[PDB]
């Protein structure tokens, strides 16, 4: 299926991320030392301090996702020993089309892991990438696998989602059922 569903998002923008050279270099804010609202500060601060250790662990195997959250901004990060290196992930406008087939063209028997995308712009000209985690766009089409039977997947395509079946497009979808660990507080 040489066919290509065009896409748009909203304020889940498509970004592309360049590898950061060590232009900028950072670390994390380490544990900070710490009359009914006295007691709330000291727990919160200790929580932040304990939760620090977690952020540490996660920074070592997925730093991009740490820095994106810490700076509320899509960024590509990677470690240089015990320190990080960052760049802004550039945004994408222009049409973002999602090839309908996940079959690999010549190598009839092998497949792609995640849907191929054609998109323009990003300094500049056409690019033949493929759909990364959560609207990363990857410049490279080399997430491959061999074609299973019963391949059903749901990829985050911009604002929405996109269902694929038997390594081939189906529709768009909104994944209706959210699950949450969010703990709201009745006020």
């Amino acid at each position, epitope marked *: 299926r040489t066919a290509v569903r065009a896409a748009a998002t909203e304020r889940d923008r498509f970004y592309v991320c360049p590898p950061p050279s060590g232009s900028t270099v950072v670390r994390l804010e380490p544990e900070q030392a710490c009359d009914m609202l006295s007691r709330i500060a000291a727990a919160w601060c200790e929580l932040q301090n304990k939760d620090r250790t977690l952020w540490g662990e996660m920074s070592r195997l997925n730093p991009s996702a740490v820095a994106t959250a810490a700076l509320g901004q899509r960024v590509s990060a990677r470690m240089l020993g015990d320190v990080m290196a960052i760049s802004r992930c550039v945004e994408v406008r222009g049409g973002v089309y999602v090839q309908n087939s996940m079959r690999v063209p*010549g190598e*009839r*028997g092998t497949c792609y892991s995640r849907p191929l995308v054609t998109f323009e712009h990003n300094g500049t000209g056409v690019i033949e990438g493929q759909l990364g985690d959560d609207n990363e766009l990857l410049i490279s089409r080399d997430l491959i696998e061999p074609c*299973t*039977g*019963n391949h059903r997947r749901y990829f985050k395509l911009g604002g929405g989602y996109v269902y694929y079946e038997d390594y081939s497009y189906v529709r768009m979808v909104e994944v209706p059922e959210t699950i949450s660990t969010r703990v709201t507080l009745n006020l």
Partner: antibody
Framework: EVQLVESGGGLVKPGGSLKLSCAAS????????MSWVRQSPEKRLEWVAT????????YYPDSVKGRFTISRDNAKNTLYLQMSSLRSDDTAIYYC????????????WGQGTILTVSS | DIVVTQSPKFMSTSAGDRVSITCKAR??????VNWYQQKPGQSPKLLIY???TRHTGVPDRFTGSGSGTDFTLTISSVQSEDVADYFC?????????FGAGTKLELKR
């Protein structure tokens, strides 16, 4: 008709080497991914190797990995299988196979390999 | 590997009668199982794919079924030629695997 002949087998000393081959007719060759499937001295059909339609990719069970090399050659529609460190329990019939889009579909004739002793 | 267990080895029926066979994959495959026939002396022959949908050639007494882990071939009214060895494979996962096989048998 989609038809399917293969050859190479015979007797081989353990640790030996042997190349099988497989003549594909009656279908547009590289459109499909080719495979190699082996029936034990009874049953089991072990999947041996599967190569991609173009050539670039191929896949293996850990059992046969390293030892066996699948290859194809689309100039004249022929699929090969290169066995080495050839081992006694590789003794089996070898059916060459055409896959549809995901799995074997027209099984070939059969082609017997054996190991160790003397005629 | 997705070990696929085809019990039983033997399976004995009678002329024109009901038969079926069971394959239990160890993880979910959904619709993605296959059954082949091997009449004595020949190679295998593809019967049913994606579970329960036939190959272009197979008589319509043959019917596969189910999905998930519990897949079962069934043959409506047996004939002479339908005696054979009967093999299931799955294709949700490389490494590719087949069942142990099941042998048919008439009664006359």
């Amino acid at each position: 008709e989609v038809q399917l002949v293969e050859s190479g087998g015979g007797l081989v000393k353990p640790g030996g080497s042997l190349k099988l081959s497989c003549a594909a007719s009656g279908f547009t060759f590289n459109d499909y991914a080719m495979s190699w499937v082996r029936q034990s001295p009874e049953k089991r059909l072990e999947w041996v190797a599967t190569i991609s339609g173009g050539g670039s990719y191929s896949y293996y069970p850990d059992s046969v990995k390293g030892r066996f090399t699948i290859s194809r050659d689309n100039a004249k529609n022929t699929l090969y299988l290169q066995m080495s460190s050839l081992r006694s329990d590789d003794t089996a019939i070898y059916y060459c196979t055409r896959q549809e889009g995901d799995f074997p579909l027209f099984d070939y004739w059969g082609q017997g390999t054996i190991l160790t002793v003397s005629s | 590997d997705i070990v696929v267990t085809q019990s039983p080895k033997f399976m004995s029926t009678s002329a024109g009668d009901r038969v079926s066979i069971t394959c239990k994959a160890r993880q979910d495959v959904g619709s993605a199982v296959n059954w082949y026939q091997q009449k004595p002396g020949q190679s295998p022959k593809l019967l049913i794919y994606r579970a329960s949908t036939r190959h272009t050639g197979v008589p319509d007494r043959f019917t596969g079924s189910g999905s998930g882990t519990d897949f079962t071939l069934t043959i409506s009214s047996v004939q002479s030629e339908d005696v054979a060895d009967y093999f299931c494979q799955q294709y949700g996962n490389y490494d590719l695997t087949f069942g142990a096989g099941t042998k048919l048998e008439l009664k006359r």
